[PDB]
């Protein structure tokens, strides 16, 4: 016989025909999947009295355990089974309720914001319901569904209950972001944004996906704070960190102005760095898991040799600050000393008037001040070999993967911002964000500036052509610009940055896949012109969308501080060496855009930044950001089993892909980064990669570490994020 | 190991067919000349063509001057110094003859009792008794010691083979069987407490644990409420987890479901309860504590073993003749072999217990196109194991008509006209629907009337040596690989699984099984018919699990699955390294 414990307490005989029928439904359109294999593996685990939801989990997992590169479609079988189960969990049936009824219920339970029912009429919800296609849930892969259920879908984290399904999340994210639009255009924007996200053309960050539609207003995940050389500013910085990490934001901290140990901050940078770390870790599990920051300082800082070794495992605890990452700031002069085999002179920023400012804003003034102060024997200073300093930095980068580089001259010569007014003096956690900041005197100082950036990405694999970006750019720019007015600001100085500059950071995912389907590779220069073409279209259309938004709604209050205001474009200021590695012409009318920006301005001081992705890429079954995949099958541990995800269209594209460790070296990838950077407003989370087994005696030579660093600089690369070393 | 030889000089004196004909000639030597040479020829043909397998002591010794053939002894220790001493003495005697021992020491009272000093120092003494005739007091000599899960000292007992810890708290060179019943499992499922008691403080509870679950429940809940009784409470989750953690890290903390051993059993538990097992967890026989090595009122259980080679029979009705041959050969050996301890002679002569199992089960499944992991073998296994038990019972019933039922036949459930098909775990009905093909109702009346020569016939033991002689897969186990490898002074010894050429895809290798469920269902199905128990393994490949760690949830679910399908015991847990 064999019995089943129904969803409450009742019991019925098992329905094996019903199970077969749901598997048959889930397998429709799929290839190389065996329903009977899934049935065999799951049914052997059933016992007399088995809970109904346990039957479901069992069959889902049985399908999931069969995901491989030879049978990739199990990704979809398992996904659809999971979707089916989640419909039953949320709705007690497969068909979702009408959208109005769902929203009314969720508002009653306090799960959705009641502003939704204020801002839209029942009639408007009925209309939005006609936009919805619940069958787009059948397009998710298994790992996508696990990401949705673990972090996106509104749920009870106490009791395990899930309350919504993916198309309700998508329609309601759209409804909330466009809620203030005039009724003449509102529902058209909603439908269009809904179609863009639910078909994976546009990707949003986790705080937006989990939160927009709910009572929260916490959506800021990326904050940049500059610390001044005073106890008051050190305190304010610490306070602002604590506030933002309790909301789970990643932090970029500029602490390079703090004066060196021994100065007339007599006790040095390090004890303040340690204090920034505990601020970052203040809201973390056991003061370690969660809470993340990258801290920035100049390469010529008097304490630099101590700073460089802060994450090194060995050493005295007093000399170590291991649970933050670091960005070392470098300009042409530092590199020139290396190439010439000369000395670098180290200074405390307190002893060298105008030098810190000049480092970022004015290279000729920096050179003049720097050589001057090097000769003045009244100034406290230290000389080190440029080779030895660079080597130490690269050694620490190599062993941790987490000593980063910012080329601060590139961040300011090729930039949306005038550096005499609004210099870029740091980056964020992940090294793609490059925005102005001002030190705080007090957590509530209204003259400070903390930079924030709202993120999204275009899915390069879901567009049939580049002119689709016109509409996607309109949608993404408008959705994020509206979010700036919607979200909360716990620190006044952060509200100032966001309201003043209205900075956005829209990037890409599925770049590897896109190259593969165009028959190009990373390593050999075959992708150079295609990347030029692609990234031109992104920036042009982003700029066009923001320019139109400015005509309609006003330029951002501090638009006059941008190079954009002076009729300067990214195509005017890029590193010239790029001309030697691509010859793609501009296909769009940048001269017309230039005049329109001069005249109407931009709604947003920045539009583009190339961030890493993991979670949003997984939802789309996209390759992450601009990165080559390590392999064809990605693997994740979970409480629900081993989660596998196969790269998109492995079946037809396996030879077209170039896997990370298949690249003979970093040159081709860095040339692509340089080409992308021609057009990108902010920066790019660029990795370097080294396989020891490609090198004599399995050791990566310092010569190659430095040559790649120099190559990055020469092609105008603004930042370097992770160094990955293959173990193997 | 088999052929008669000079172990000093290296000389070999015989060849395999002389061994086989002479084993047959010796075992059937007392038969009337009217049938004698016919039995000899038939038994000779069965063994030399690999249809029946015998243990090493029989193969090396029957034909030679020795009478030492007992390899499997079960000794129950009472809660007294005299019984502790007698038990130790009997162990020493039997390990000098190279027998494996099952020791029940769960009656010894806990540390702190009005055995003031505890179980452990007595366990240590049993170990040196077991190791007393071993090379450098370690190589050779093997025992499994049994105790109840509710024993007051259980948390100390559970960790006895753990590598770290004080030497005084460790007894590492014996294995352990933890005894469990439905009530213990119910506490786990309900997230409740288990109460630990010394067996000396709880009148009738130890006895009831094995013999009468409703009386156990009544006594147990009573004593849990009586605050005059010394006791300790532990979380069932924590206790079960600790046991499973020790099972996982050593592979050698075993389980006996003592209710199953007594509700589904050849023996009436009010008279002759099963309260322990042997070294390898397939033997389940009654015992009584000794007062003295030579106590004539003690009972030590012995069992004579053999196996049918499932790969050498063309069909199941061949088992009729093989069962006649195997039952008769082993029954004759009971009268032939020596008994160094009177209480062991009592068990053997009183109950005449046999343990006939199988080898080549994996191969048999493969050639029938079935697998372990997916339920495809359920009905075939039901059919196969019905035939084994039916024909074993039939052979022993005929032997009883001819020679007499065993002296203590009246203590069996068999005597009351109860059969294995009457008492099996009902849940088995949900996982097989094979009908009975044999006339069990006719057999029932014949057993009621003429009895059995032997109180038990069937037990599923591990094999290694006898399987190798036949080039059979071992016991009921899937092979780890297609080629087995052994070190020797003569080189690397390889053995390929039978009919690899035609069957390589039909085989299901141990680590190819997605999990333990299908195998445990087969074990449960086998156990429907088996008189004693089965040396059932559990297996886990870390690389099938997130972050390479086997979850406790899965360890406990498999344990529960075993229980639900009426599995009596769990032997080795194998963890793949890789």
């Amino acid at each position: 016989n064999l019995l089943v414990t129904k969803r409450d307490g009742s019991t019925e005989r098992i329905n094996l025909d019903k199970i077969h029928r749901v598997l048959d439904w889930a397998a429709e359109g799929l290839h190389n999947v065996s329903i009977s294999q899934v049935e065999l593996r799951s049914h052997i685990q059933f016992y007399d009295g088995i809970k109904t939801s346990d039957i479901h989990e069992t069959i889902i997992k049985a399908a999931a355990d069969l995901i491989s590169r030879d049978a990739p479609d199990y990704q979809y079988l398992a996904a659809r089974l999971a979707i089916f189960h989640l419909r039953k969990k949320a709705y007690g049936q497969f068909e979702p309720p009408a959208l109005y009824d769902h929203v009314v219920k969720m508002v009653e339970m306090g799960k959705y914001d009641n502003h939704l029912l204020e801002d839209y009429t029942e009639e408007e919800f009925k209309q939005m319901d006609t936009f919805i296609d619940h069958d787009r849930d059948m397009t998710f892969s298994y790992a996508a569904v696990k990401q949705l259920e673990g972090k996106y879908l509104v749920q009870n984290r106490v009791t395990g209950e899930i309350y919504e399904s993916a198309q309700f999340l998508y329609i309601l994210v759209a409804a909330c972001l466009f809620s203030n639009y005039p009724r003449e255009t509102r529902l058209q924007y909603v439908k269009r944004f809904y179609d863009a996200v639910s078909t994976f053309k546009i990707s949003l960050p986790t705080p937006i996906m989990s939160g927009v539609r709910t009572p929260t207003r916490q959506f800021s995940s990326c904050v940049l704070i500059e610390c001044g050389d005073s106890l008051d500013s050190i305190n304010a910085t610490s306070s602002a960190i604590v506030k933002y990490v309790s909301q789970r934001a990643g932090i970029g901290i500029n602490a390079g102005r703090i004066r060196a140990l021994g100065s007339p901050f007599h006790t040095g940078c390090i004890p303040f760095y340690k204090h920034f770390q505990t601020a970052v870790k203040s809201c973390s599990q056991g003061g370690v898991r969660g809470g993340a920051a990258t801290l920035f300082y100049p390469m010529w800082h008097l304490e630099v040799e101590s700073l460089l070794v802060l994450k090194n495992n060995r050493g005295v605890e007093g000399n170590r600050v291991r649970h933050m990452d670091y960005g070392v700031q470098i300009n042409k002069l530092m590199y020139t000393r290396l190439l010439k085999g000369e000395d670098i002179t180290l200074f405390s920023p307190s002893d060298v008037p105008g030098l810190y400012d000049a480092f970022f804003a004015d290279q000729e003034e920096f050179e003049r001040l720097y050589t001057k102060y090097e000769k003045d024997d009244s100034i406290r200073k230290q000389r080190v070999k440029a080779v030895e300093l660079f080597s130490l930095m690269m050694q620490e980068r190599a062993s941790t993967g987490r000593i980063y580089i910012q080329n601060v001259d590139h961040c300011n010569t090729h930039s949306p911002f005038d550096p005499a007014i609004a210099p870029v003096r740091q980056s964020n956690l992940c090294l793609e964000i490059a925005l102005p900041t001002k030190p705080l005197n007090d957590v509530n100082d209204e003259n400070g500036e903390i930079a924030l950036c709202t993120l999204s990405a275009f899915n390069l694999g879901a567009i049939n052509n580049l002119d689709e970006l016109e509409e996607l750019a309109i949608l993404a720019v408008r959705a994020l610009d509206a979010l700036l007015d919607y979200q909360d600001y716990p620190i006044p100085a952060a509200k100032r940055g966001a309201m003043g500059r209205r900075t956005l950071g829209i990037g890409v995912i599925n770049f590897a896949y896109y190259l593969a389907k165009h028959g190009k590779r990373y390593s050999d220069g075959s992708a150079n012109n295609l990347t030029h073409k692609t990234f031109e279209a992104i920036q042009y259309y982003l700029l066009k969308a923001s320019n139109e938004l400015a005509k309609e709604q006003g330029a951002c209050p501090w638009f006059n501080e941008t190079t954009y205001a002076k009729g300067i474009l990214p195509i005017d200021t890029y590193k010239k060496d790029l001309d030697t590695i691509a010859n793609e012409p501009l296909h769009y009318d940048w001269e017309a855009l230039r005049e329109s920006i001069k005249t109407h301005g931009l709604r947003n001081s920045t539009l583009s930044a190339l961030m890493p992705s993991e979670t949003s890429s997984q939802i789309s079954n996209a390759t992450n950001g601009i990165e080559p995949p390590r392999g064809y099958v990605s693997i994740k541990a979970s409480k629900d089993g081993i989660l596998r995800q196969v790269v998109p269209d492995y079946e037809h594209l396996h030879d077209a892909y170039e896997l990370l460790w298949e690249m003979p070296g970093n040159d081709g990838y860095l040339q692509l980064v340089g080409i992308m950077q021609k057009f990108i407003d902010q920066s790019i989370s660029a990795n370097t990669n080294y396989d020891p087994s490609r090198f004599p005696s399995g050791k990566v030579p310092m010569q190659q570490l430095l040559k790649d660093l120099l190559t990055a600089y020469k092609f105008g690369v603004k930042t370097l994020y992770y160094q990955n070393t293959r173990d193997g | 190991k088999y052929l008669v030889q000079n172990r000093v000089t290296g000389e070999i004196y015989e060849s395999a067919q002389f061994l086989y004909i002479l084993v047959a000639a010796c075992l059937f030597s007392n038969y009337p000349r009217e049938t004698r040479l016919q039995y000899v020829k038939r038994f000779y043909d069965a063994v030399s063509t690999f249809k029946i397998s015998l243990p090493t002591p029989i193969m090396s010794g029957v034909r030679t001057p020795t009478r030492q053939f007992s390899s499997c002894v079960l000794i129950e220790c009472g809660d007294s110094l005299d019984s502790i001493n007698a038990t130790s003495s009997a162990i020493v005697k039997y390990v000098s003859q190279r027998a494996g021992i099952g020791i029940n020491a769960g009656r010894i009272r806990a540390l702190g009792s009005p055995f003031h000093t505890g179980c452990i120092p007595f366990y240590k003494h049993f170990q040196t008794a077991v190791k007393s005739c071993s090379q450098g007091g370690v190589r050779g000599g093997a025992a499994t010691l049994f105790y109840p899960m509710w024993h007051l000292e259980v948390e100390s007992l559970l960790v006895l083979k753990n590598n770290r810890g004080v030497e005084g708290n460790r007894v590492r060179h014996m294995d352990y069987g933890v005894q469990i019943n439905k009530l213990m499992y119910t506490r786990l499922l309900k997230g409740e407490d288990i109460t630990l008691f010394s067996p000396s403080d709880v009148p009738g509870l130890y006895d009831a644990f094995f013999a009468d679950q409703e009386e156990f429940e009544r006594l147990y809940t009573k004593y849990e409420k009586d605050d005059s009784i010394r006791k300790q409470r532990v979380k069932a989750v924590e206790l079960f987890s600790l046991m499973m953690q020790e099972r996982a890290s050593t592979g050698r903390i075993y389980i006996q479901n003592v209710d199953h051993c007594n509700t589904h059993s050849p023996f009436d538990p009010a008279i002759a309860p099963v309260r322990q097992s042997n070294l390898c967890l397939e033997i389940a026989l009654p015992t009584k504590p000794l007062n003295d090595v030579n106590d004539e009122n003690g009972e030590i259980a012995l069992c004579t073993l053999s196996a049918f080679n499932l790969g050498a029979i063309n069909n199941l009705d061949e088992l009729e003749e093989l069962a006649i041959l195997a039952v008769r050969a082993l029954d004759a050996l009971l009268d032939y072999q020596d008994y160094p301890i009177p209480a062991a002679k009592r068990g053997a002569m009183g109950r005449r217990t046999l343990g006939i199992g199988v080898i080549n089960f994996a191969y048999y499944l493969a050639k029938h196109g079935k697998r372990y992991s997916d339920g495809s073998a359920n009905n075939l296994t039901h059919k196969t194991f019905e035939a084994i038990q039916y024909y074993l019972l039939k052979a022993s019933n005929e032997l009883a008509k001819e020679q007499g039922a065993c002296p203590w036949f009246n203590e069996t459930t068999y005597a009351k006209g109860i059969l294995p098909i009457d008492t099996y775990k009902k849940d088995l009905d949900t996982i097989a629907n094979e009908p009975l093909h044999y006339d069990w109702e006719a057999l029932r009346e014949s057993i009621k009337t003429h009895g059995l020569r032997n109180s038990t016939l069937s037990a599923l033991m591990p094999s290694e040596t006898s399987s190798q002689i036949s080039n059979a897969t071992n016991g009921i186990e899937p092979p780890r690989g297609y080629v087995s490898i052994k070190a020797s002074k003569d080189g690397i010894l390889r053995q390929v699984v039978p009919d690899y050429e035609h069957l390589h895809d039909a085989y299901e290798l141990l680590w190819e099984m997605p999990g333990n469920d299908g195998y445990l269902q087969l074990v449960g199905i086998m156990q429907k018919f088996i008189d004693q128990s089965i040396s059932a393994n559990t297996n886990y490949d870390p690389s099938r699990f997130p972050s390479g760690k086997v979850p406790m949830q899965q360890l406990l679910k498999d344990l529960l699955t075993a229980y639900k399908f009426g599995v009596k015991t769990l032997y080795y847990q194998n963890t793949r390294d890789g």
């Binding site: 007399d48 346990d54 | 699990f545 972050s547 949830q553």
Partner: peptide, 16 residues
């Protein structure tokens, strides 16, 4: 090693 995590609610379902 093993994962000692035990969901006590999942167990309660089982029917001995």
């Amino acid at each position: 090693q093993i994962d000692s995590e035990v969901d006590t609610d999942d167990l309660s379902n089982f029917q001995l």
